[PDB]
Amino acid sequence: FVVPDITTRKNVGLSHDANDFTLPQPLDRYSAEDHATWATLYQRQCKLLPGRACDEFMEGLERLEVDADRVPDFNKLNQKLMAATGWKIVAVPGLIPDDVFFEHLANRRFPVTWWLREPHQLDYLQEPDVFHDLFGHVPLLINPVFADYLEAYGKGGVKAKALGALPMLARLYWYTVEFGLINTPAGMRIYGAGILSSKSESIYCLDSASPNRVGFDLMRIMNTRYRIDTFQKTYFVIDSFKQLFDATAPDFAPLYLQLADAQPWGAGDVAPDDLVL
């Protein structure tokens, strides 16, 4: 039997743009259950993340006044975000086409799935939801270096699309914005949204001897596969957000062509030139 997935179920009776896929955030659709689920997830992460999340992330939560007790009003959040870095969040139905996603980031709009996981899915949801997209991704947009990195990433979509290289950019996004670590004098910390919204990947990625922690390298990352349904086997570590922005400086086109005829590293592989931490 095939049943409708959660994205389909949540969006019944709603619409979105055929070209850019946004909709007004549907506040009427959040039930008391949703606000309680949000509050529980927020509480859970706020207990776990001190000393694990990077300090910029924690400060972003407070500066943006992300509600602890209810799903946030995107419009209210935007007032603070816009004044900080000129970015805004836009509501989308769920996963959107790549070219639309890049056009959004290139224009300083960050797409956020509007709906929330059901209470029985508190521990984990496969598809992004509003807790992962808002709590996980948005606080760092207050940081001008990180915000400029996302904008530069977005701007690179047109070239990647023209060259059949969108999956190579997707690897960069996955291993930085979703699953990145940052080294600090206080020790390793987390900036990746997929880790920051997780029940326990925050514990594994810093505490476990199992995953590889490898120094950031652009070419290596764009040649590295990832899986979506397990903890990461490798995490890439930056020294500063400036390193990410600076990595977007060169022309990616010759990098894409050289990678196009390479075999990619598996998610668990250690490459010969890896700086292993």
- Binding site, annotated residues for Fe cation: 132, 137, 178
Q: How far is the CB of 194 from Co ion (least distance, A)?
A: 5
Centre a 10 Å sphere on the Cβ of residue 108 and count the other Cβ atoms it contains.
18
Give the torsion through C-alpha atoms of 61, 188, 193, 218, to 10 deg: 130
Nearer to Co ion, 71 or 112 (CB): 112
For Co ion, give the closer residue by CB, 178 or 201. 178
Q: How far is the CB of 105 from Co ion (least distance, A)?
A: 12
For 58, other C-beta atoms within 10 Å of its C-beta total: 18
Which residues belong to the annotated binding site? 132, 137, 178
Q: For Cα atoms 234, 213, 233, give the angle at the middle one, nearest 5 degrees.
A: 20
CA distance 90 to 273: 40
The DSSP symbol for 188 reads E
Stretch that binds Co ion, among 170-178, 224-232, 245-253, 260-268 (CB under 5 A): 170-178
Which lies closer to Co ion via its Cβ, residue 125 or residue 253?
125
By C-beta, is 56 or 178 nearer to Co ion?
178
Contact 222, 153 (CB under 8 A): no
Residue 241 near residue 55 (C-beta atoms within 8 A) = no
> Hey, which residues between 219 and 258 contact Co ion (CB under 5 A)?
none
Q: How far is the CB of 186 from Co ion (least distance, A)?
A: 25
Restricting to residues 254-273, which ones interact with Co ion according to CB under 5 A? none
CB 137 to Co ion: min, Å: 6
Using CB under 5 A, which of the segments 108-116, 148-156, 175-183, 223-231 binds Co ion? 175-183
List 138, 181, 193, 206, residue binding Co ion (CB under 5 A): 193
Residue least distant from Co ion (Cβ): 193
- The closest of 190, 167, 162, 189 to 178, measured between CA atoms, is 190
What is the C-alpha to C-alpha distance for residues 238 and 176, in angstroms, rounded to an integer? Answer: 9
Binding span for Co ion by CB under 5 A among 99-107, 191-199, 204-212, 249-257: 191-199
Please tell me the count of residues contacting Co ion according to CB under 5 A. Answer: 2
Asked if residue 172 binds Co ion (CB under 5 A), the reply is: no
130/259 with CB nearer Co ion: 130
Which of 114, 111, 115 minimizes the C-alpha distance to 103? 111
CB of 226 to Co ion, least distance (A): 12
Spatial distance between the Cα atoms of 118 and 94, rounded to a whole number of angstroms: 15
Identify the CA nearest to 256 among candidates 222, 207, 208, 214: 222
**Strands 109-113, 212-215: parallel, antiparallel or unpaired by DSSP?**
unpaired
Smallest gap from residue 187 Cβ to Co ion (A) = 24
| DSSP-derived secondary structure for 242-262 | HHHHHHTSS-SHHHHHHHHTS
Cβ distance to Co ion smaller for residue 179 or 241: 179
Query: What residue ranges bind Co ion (CB under 5 A)?
Result: 178, 193
